Amino acid sequence: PQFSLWKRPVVTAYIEGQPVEVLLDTGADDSIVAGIELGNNYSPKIVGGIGGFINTLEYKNVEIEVLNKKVRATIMTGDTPINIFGRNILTALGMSLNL
Amino acid sequence: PQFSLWKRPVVTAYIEGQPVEVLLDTGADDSIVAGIELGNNYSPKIVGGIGGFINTLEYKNVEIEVLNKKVRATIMTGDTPINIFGRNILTALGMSLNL
Incomplete structure (x- = not known):
């Protein structure tokens, strides 16, 4: 809907019938x-963070x-402290930054 | 304005005169x-992310x-790869993250 950038913008999701509570990271x-098991149709990947x-x-x-829509998109599984959805799922959902 | 996330929401802001191309990040x-000489009046914080x-x-x-808006804020200094604008100054400019 709208998200005030006061409280962190977490959302509960279903990553293929599996319930996961998520962050809307626009810097992602x-x-x-x-903490999820997608399949065996993965690809070894490297992603950088703020500490490396x-x-x-x-x-x-x-x-x-999530948010009352269905999206099929590209999920990475690694050790993220918090599960983050990036600019990749934000645009499927059809979110922006309104000033 | 408006920011869609097919491109990362980077723009130029001014930190007492010094421009730094920044990322608007709902995840910070x-x-x-x-790369900002601010002061010798600081408190060494530590923050984690992806990679620690x-x-x-x-x-x-x-x-x-930033974006024709003028504010006073808290920002840190450290070896952040890209310049990040957390929510702290996402709610100063008074942004929202909208579907």
Whole structure:
């Protein structure tokens, strides 16, 4: 709807029928997610952070259902402290930054 | 304005005169920068993300000029790769993250 940038902008999601509570990170290229089992159709990936680089696993065209829409998009699985959805899922949802 | 997230929401802001091309990040709490001589009046903070932790030198009451908006803020200094604008100054400019 709108999100005031006062409280962190977390949302509960379903990353292929599996419930995960997520952050809307607009400083994120991607979306990450620890604690899920996507398949075996991954790709060894590296993503950098604010304190450095990690390795994720990259599963294409994952069903995802958040905010009352369905999206199939590209989820990485690595050790993210918080599960983040990036500019990649924000534009599927059809969010922006309104000033 | 408006920001769509097919491109990362980068723009130029002013930290007492010094422009730094920044990223508007709903995933940051606080606004972290690199390559800014602010003061010798700071408190060394530490913040973590993806890849862990960096140490910052948090500075308080710090005027910023971004997107034709003029504000005073808290931003840190540290070895952040890209200049990040956390929410702290996302709610000063008074942004929202809208569907």
